[PDB]
Amino acid sequence: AIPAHRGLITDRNGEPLAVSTPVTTLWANPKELMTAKERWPQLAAALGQDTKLFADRIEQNAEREFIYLVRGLTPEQGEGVIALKVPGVYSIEEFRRFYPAGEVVAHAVGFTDVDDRGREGIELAFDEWLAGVPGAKPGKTLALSIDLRLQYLAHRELRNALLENGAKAGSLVIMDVKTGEILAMTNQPTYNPNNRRQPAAMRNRAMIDVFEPGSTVKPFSMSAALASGRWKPSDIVDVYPGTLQIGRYTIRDVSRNSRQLDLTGILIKSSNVGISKIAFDIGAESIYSVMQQVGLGQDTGLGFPGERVGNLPNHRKWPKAETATLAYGYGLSVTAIQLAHAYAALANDGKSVPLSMTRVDRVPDGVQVISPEVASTVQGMLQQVVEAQGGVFRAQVPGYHAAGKSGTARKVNAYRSLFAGFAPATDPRIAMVVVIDEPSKAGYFGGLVSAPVFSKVMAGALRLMNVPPDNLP
């Protein structure tokens, strides 16, 4: 059968990301080869094979009318073999993929197996569209949501942060909050898909690795508090003395020099005690509902085989310890894609637009998952988290009002450093998640390790997208 030309993958502006390259496959009729044994050695040497092992193979297939000699020669190598003019040697034009951006977008684009079928990423997810039909009809062009310009920036900054932090791994996702598009998705470690010759390096961690989101979910606990009718931002919580006992469990703040904190101060000081006390007052049910509605631990609908769903704990009757730990993101499992999608809903005034890895021309209707008034109040609080005295100043994006939240998880001393946010605050365009796994220098807090990567990637992304600076007089 005649292998078909696989569809071109492009970025959202038409830059090529996966291109079908002509190769030559050689096959032989042994019955005819066996009439030309004197030609075999120069045919073996032309295929870089030992004369004796080549000869053994043909002799062991003397009564098969077909065998492959080699697959995936360049046309030039295949020409050299054809020019030997060996009886019983034939050629087929096959296709191998080339990935012009290589390691930069390897996890998103994926790659094809020996037979030119998708094995990972978009190549796998859109195989039916890309493949076409073997004779023979060509596969179809696919434009991704990815902007190669934002992807290059995200890739470079996440690489530099891993090296500066001596970290094991990392992910970074950028989303268009208005369209649901994935504009960048990068992971470390990465691989060159044009030279496969580590399984670890091939993992799209942003989609297939789950982690505890920790304190990055506090904005969703606060959304539930503001929607309950029992809380406003200027309300106070007494978090003294920085700890709270629930039977056997102790809730702890890292900084314990607080008594009265307003709701914004609970976020600035990442007080687990403060969010736990609000959680006890409003009930875990309300918080669970917000987290489920923004898609934490829920199917993204992206249909990448091997994509993880994670898990959001649920109860009929929430025990007090589980109520506290839900509200500060302990014992949840989410993906970086889910966390970025949730932040996009908050940024898009509480409307969730379905996630897309393909370029969106006609934007589907969004679902109102949080009330626009609550969403807008939480945005303003997350802007104070970044800008306020004592805030996460390393997330500040010079030129723009940015907003977001740090997290730091102790794994089970190894850490995960998180920052999730959006910008600009006065009409958000972009949501971003930065996850750095096991930073190994003195700093491991999300506000130290991930927040500066957010700042640098957001500064470039907003400028690459010509977003007008909103920090004006």
Q: Is the dihedral of CA 235, 241, 247, 252 positive or negative?
A: positive
> Which amino acid is present at 328?
Y
CB of 165 to ligand XVG, least distance (A): 14
CB of 248 to ligand XVG, least distance (A): 16
40, 330, 343, 454: which one binds ligand XVG (CB under 6 A) = 330
118, 242, 329, 421: which one binds ligand XVG (CB under 6 A) = 329
- Residue 410 sits in the site that holds ligand XVG (CB under 6 A): yes
Task: Pick left, alpha or beta for residue 365 (phi over 0 → left; psi -120 to 50 → alpha; otherwise beta).
Answer: beta
- Computed on alpha carbons and rounded to an integer, the radius of gyration of the chain in Å comes to 27
> Which amino acid is present at 127?
D
- Residue 384 sits in the site that holds ligand XVG (CB under 6 A): no
**Is 145 within 8 Å of 182 (Cβ atoms)?**
yes
CB of 302 to ligand XVG, least distance (A): 25
CB of 333 to ligand XVG, least distance (A): 10
The owner of tokens 């609550």 is 374
Contacting range for ligand XVG; rule: CB under 6 A; set: 45-53, 293-301, 356-364, 445-453: 445-453
Contacts of 305 (CB under 8 A, 6+ apart): 124, 125
Is 215 a known active-site residue?
Answer: yes
24, 179, 190, 270: which one binds ligand XVG (CB under 6 A) = 270
**Is 371 within 8 Å of 226 (Cβ atoms)?**
no
Contacts of 180 (CB under 8 A, 6+ apart): 341, 344, 353, 354, 355, 356, 360, 363, 364, 366
Distances in whole angstroms, Cα of residue 286 to Cα of each of 162, 225, 270, 272, 292: 37, 8, 21, 18, 10
Comparison of 43 and 169: residue with beta carbon closer to ligand XVG: 169
CB atoms within 10 A of CB 114: 10
Contact mark string toward ligand XVG, 240..259, x via CB under 6 A = --------------xx----
Which string of DSSP letters, residue by residue, matches 254-287?
S----SEEEHHHHHHTT-HHHHHHHHHHH-HHHH
445, 457, 462, 470: which one binds ligand XVG (CB under 6 A) = 445
407, 421, 424, 460: which one binds ligand XVG (CB under 6 A) = 407
CB of 272 to ligand XVG, least distance (A): 5
Q: Shortest Cβ contact with ligand XVG: which residue?
A: 215
242 — phi, psi (to 5°)?
90, 5
Comparison of 26 and 409: residue with beta carbon closer to ligand XVG: 409
Contacting range for ligand XVG; rule: CB under 6 A; set: 19-27, 50-58, 232-240, 402-410: 402-410
**Catalytic option among 20, 145, 171, 215:** 215
Contacting range for ligand XVG; rule: CB under 6 A; set: 56-64, 326-334, 344-352, 358-366: 326-334
- Residue 408 sits in the site that holds ligand XVG (CB under 6 A): yes
CB of 418 to ligand XVG, least distance (A): 7
- Residue 191 sits in the site that holds ligand XVG (CB under 6 A): no
**Is 22 within 8 Å of 93 (Cβ atoms)?**
yes
Which positions lie near ligand XVG, rule CB under 6 A?
212, 214-215, 254-255, 270, 272, 328-330, 406-410, 445-447
So which residues are the catalytic ones? 215
